[PDB]
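Tutorial sheet, problem 5. The six components below are modelled jointly, 1555 residues in total.
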Amino acid sequence: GGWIRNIGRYLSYLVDDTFEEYAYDVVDGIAKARTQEELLEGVYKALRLAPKLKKKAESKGCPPPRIPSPEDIEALEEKVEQLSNPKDLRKLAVSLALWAFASWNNCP
Amino acid sequence: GWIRNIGRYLSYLVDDTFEEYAYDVVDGIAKARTQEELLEGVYKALRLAPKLKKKAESKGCPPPRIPSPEDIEALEEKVEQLSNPKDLRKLAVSLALWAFASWNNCP
Amino acid sequence: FNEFKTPQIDPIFDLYVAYGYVVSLIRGGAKEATLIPHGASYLIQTDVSNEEFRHGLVDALSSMLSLHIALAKLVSDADFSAGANINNVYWDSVPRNLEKLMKDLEKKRSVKGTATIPITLMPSAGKYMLKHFGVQGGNPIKVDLLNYALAWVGFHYYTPYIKYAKGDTTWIHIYQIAPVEEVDMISILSLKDLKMHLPHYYESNLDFLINRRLALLYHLLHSEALELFTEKEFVIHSYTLERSGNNQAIRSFEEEEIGKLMDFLWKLKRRDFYHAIKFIDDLLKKATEGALALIDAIMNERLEGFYTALKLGKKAGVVSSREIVAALEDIIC
Amino acid sequence: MYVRISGRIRLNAHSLNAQGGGGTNYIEITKTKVTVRTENGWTVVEVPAITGNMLKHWHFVGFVDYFKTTPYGVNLTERALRYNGTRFGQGETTATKANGATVQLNDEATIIKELADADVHGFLAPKTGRRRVSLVKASFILPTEDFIKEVEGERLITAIKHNRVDVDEKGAIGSSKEGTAQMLFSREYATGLYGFSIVLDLGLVGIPQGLPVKFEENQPRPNIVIDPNERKARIESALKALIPMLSGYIGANLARSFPVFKVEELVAIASEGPIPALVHGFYEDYIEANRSIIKNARALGFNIEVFTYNVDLGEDIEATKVSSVEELVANLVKM
Amino acid sequence: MYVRISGRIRLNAHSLNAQGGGGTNYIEITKTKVTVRTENGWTVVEVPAITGNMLKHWHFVGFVDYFKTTPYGVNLTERALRYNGTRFGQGETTATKANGATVQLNDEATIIKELADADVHGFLAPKTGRRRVSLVKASFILPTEDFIKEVEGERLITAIKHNRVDVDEKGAIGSSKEGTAQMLFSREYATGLYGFSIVLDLGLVGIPQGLPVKFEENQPRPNIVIDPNERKARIESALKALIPMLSGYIGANLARSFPVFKVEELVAIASEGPIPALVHGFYEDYIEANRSIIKNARALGFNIEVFTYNVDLGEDIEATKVSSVEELVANLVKMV
Amino acid sequence: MYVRISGRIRLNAHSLNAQGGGGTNYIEITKTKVTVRTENGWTVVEVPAITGNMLKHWHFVGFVDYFKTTPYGVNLTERALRYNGTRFGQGETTATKANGATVQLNDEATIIKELADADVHGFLAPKTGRRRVSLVKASFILPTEDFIKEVEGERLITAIKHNRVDVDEKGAIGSSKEGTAQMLFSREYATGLYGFSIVLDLGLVGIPQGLPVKFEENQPRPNIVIDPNERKARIESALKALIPMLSGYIGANLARSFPVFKVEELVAIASEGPIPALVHGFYEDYIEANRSIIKNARALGFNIEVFTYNVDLGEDIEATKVSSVEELVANLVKMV
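Model answer (structure tokens):
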């Protein structure tokens, strides 16, 4: 519903260059989500690095990361609570995690 | 139609200049019957981006370019409504079809 | 309208004789000649005279015999002497029959004999025919020498074929293109352009001449006569002759179609030509299984065949450029 | 007696009825064109279809195998022992049995009395005519049109390559000049759900073709020129011949493939008199045709026993449930 | 005798019957299509499978392994001792025995007497034309329909990539221009619950196909060209060849893979006579079908002996609860 | 003398048989798909595991280590002395002996006589085609099914990040522009109660596969190209190679990881004649399967001996309780 791109923008900061933060394990966990609880755990692990990247973004002449809004969190919770089937859960978990590896122009 | 850009990225996994030969992902993306496994295969193919980046960087030729985020949502804005496998194959096979193109990468 | 009738004997030999009628007319002139298919009769309508038809026929026979004398009981490595005739006796029988026809016609004398028909002109023939409770000795089927010579002229001038030796054995693929609705003289001449003489390839690298469909694909790859098959409907009747240990027999008689393959080739080569023929030849030489999958996909409109062919080709030596991939994508629609 | 069995079967990973590839290193399975409707369109699909020649050959093999157990197996040609069955020819006027007994070909009655295979699968003598038709006939084995409609595309033909390594005395291998035999051939294995239909005229077994009845005492009783006990033994052997038929014993490449076989559904009609063939299993609506033809035949006065396996065929008809092929065999040996 | 076996085996992490060569990168495993219900129309799914050629070759290997220890092991082909399946290929007429003696491929009885591999597994003599139908027939190894329905198409293939450390004697990892072969390749390993079925026709061993009977005293005496003790020993060796069958010796790449095998359940029937073929384990409902088959056959007047492992079967017909493959082959050889 | 060993061993904080990254800082561990029975139906789960190739390589390392001390250790390969796993790469026809001499590859008997490593672990020489299968069979180190049942997966993976601090002479971390190598890689570690199984086919050492018997007067006998002392030394070294296998010498990263690698339980069989392999420790119900496969084997006439550690084997089975792998290998070498 448009929040996938917003959350993927923040997820891409966990693996892109110019950040010295190569967190691939969290991306693998959020992409290999077999059940909703571990998907939420991976989302929390990814979001725990929001201060980690926000504090150092201004320390290297880069714009602050686009931290997802609480509306994005609400949408994610609504989507998770309505998915009791791993079938569509797999593709939903793949969708946002795919945005991590992209050619984002974070630092001009 | 956002096909050449992703095809050239998938070509990075088959060309001999990248001595890793990621052929399983090509089979996964080509042999896709419904929505989930196609997305799984494309995610697996995209996950090896640092591999290609550090392989080209450590070899001399310019590093490969990741598919742009602008057509990332374009991939999921169409494949969602391809409920029928018959018309889904037209793109699932084509994704690997464009993975074997020439795609000159390094001089 | 002279509207020549064609004997109704065998829709393959019938096709050969009715389909060499056109070249006989052309060599004698006979403008505005057309062919109406009658299922098997394959009648031809034209405004030529009988003497003019005979003059064209003797011109064709003169050209054929002049070609035959180029190689040497005289045995030549030509289409109608030994290239297509799998039986050794026909290598001498056919030239004698043709020169007899020449001698008879040049003296304004109609032929008054009948001769055996080889399996090359009509695979439906052979050595034995079931009458009631067994076969007939010798060769039961016989044809008048005039139609025999006309069908031989048509086969030599129009129908492409391929011979692959591979040591003791021998494979001969024979292809004939059959119109189904209607054709004029220019169409039939365009089909005649496909015929190329002395296709005795042998060697060992070109071992892909087996798998008849693959062989015809290879032959049609280097042919650029006319994209007539996209505007007219044509079929292909093809068959194989094998001489494994002097055991002359036919093992394949499938009836495929030529429109789809020509359409595919034209669509693929419309983008790039340098990367088309080299691509196809490399894939044929290296990935024979990939080539079989590709031709199966072409004849069946199957998506997985193209992917399998490209994967197998890229495994060994195939570059598989971008433009051909784009052409394949466009064909996929 | 007269029985007719038509149904749909499930088999996969088979190389049945290939084109041999005697001179070509590539072995091709049968390739056939089948016309099918495609929602207002008459398209053609290239799928394998197994010839009934191999089906009849394997039925004869099963019959000759089951006829050895019975004590009345002496009346059998020595040719049939080797899975042969040419049955003479132009230059043959003498029949050799298993024990090596000379049999003349003057009349069909003596031939069928002394030979059992010729009585079932027929024979001919071009020297003197006296042709006899086969009492067992089998149709082609092709995928049903419903399966073709459901699958539409897809290769469903796997080309698997197998090599033949042959090293020298110590370890040396050779390609084309060391004199060894090293070939890398390819086999096409097919899949899909097929449809079959077979007709077995056991009612004419042991009766000369030219003399169906005697009609000497004003009663046209059947002309059973052979002994009734061994006649019934022949009937039982021919019935049990179907046991190595719906089990995976059909075709070639049995040593290397042995196809995974399981019959899905079938309908069989058995009667003591002549009865029509129902339908080939290729058609998707063949159940309705079966029901209609059975109803018509029963309305025309035919005492038909209907055995159905994994198919309803309507509740109005008197259909007997069949658990498996052995159940049908057990139900058939009663008559 | 005639014995038929059908059951399920739990097999995982196996690169059996690979397609790509040793030097070819990304060594690919064979796949076969299977037709399944999936509570809708018959759908075709491509799944990894094991060809019957491998099973036949490994049965031959086990047969020669268990026949060499027998006193009659000298009556064997030289190629059999090499575990080579090339039995009288194209371009030869005389063959070599195990001890080096020559054998003529002219009379089938002599071939099956002096050689045992060509008897049990059949043979072909293209130069002469002599042939023998194999008495051992092995089916494909397909995953069960219920299992493939449950997995709902989850690949079930692991493409594990590995290489070597081929290095120059000086300690430098050379390129293709140095002389090393440090190349990257992959191997495909499969997993799942497979079904197996193999049939044996040992009742016709030692019997030429040209003359199955002799008819000396007007009785159906079989034409046993070999000694009855030799025939019994060959039958026992063939039956004991099933011991390494369901143990982990029915595939290739055993040195680097050694696939993990475990028989879950199976059935076997033998009656020293004609017997209907058992239903393959690829079908989920094979238990009831086989129960019906072996109950009707027994009711038809057949002395069918049934040994079942880890299945209730019908719990009313004569079935012996066998515990392992070794006990099953012991029961099979006890009734010779 | 043939040996088949199986059992369960616990691994903690292990990074054995990883991908190594190559072009990434994240060092992935090898993953394989295994089948779990499950109360809800058969399923497939991706778990870390160690391929049999690494186990075979480490067995080879242990064998050469224990064979160098032997007086006949000179008959080895320079590559074998250098712990190189390649044997007769493409394009080569000669072997570099441990003594420095040159060994021809035109005869397999000479190779197995002068190269103990090629005799034991097999070899392949494509240039001359000389092939010899390995006498040691190593299975995949797979986590046992009941362990997955108990833990419900838990992802069994930890990622630990380590930096590579490149301090120059001036004591600076650099900025990827002066020549520094300051990066941050990650290593993947796993744990679990895995199952292991090995097969020692120690019956063909010194015996060429092209001629196992001589048949001087129709009496079978092994054809050994070496003196019996060398055969005994090779057998003892191969059996002792298990000592640096069940103590912590499996897998890579021994410098940093060095897995805990404690043996939990083991059952082994040893017999002079041919014997079937045991069931792998991955399946929970394999101890009873082992008992059924050894008692039945003893019921056919196999002179077998069973060594058990942490497994009771009941009371009917005559098995010796072995305290540790040292007594196990001592018993193994005791029976020649």
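Marking note: The longest strand of chain E covers residues 184-201. Full credit if you identified this.
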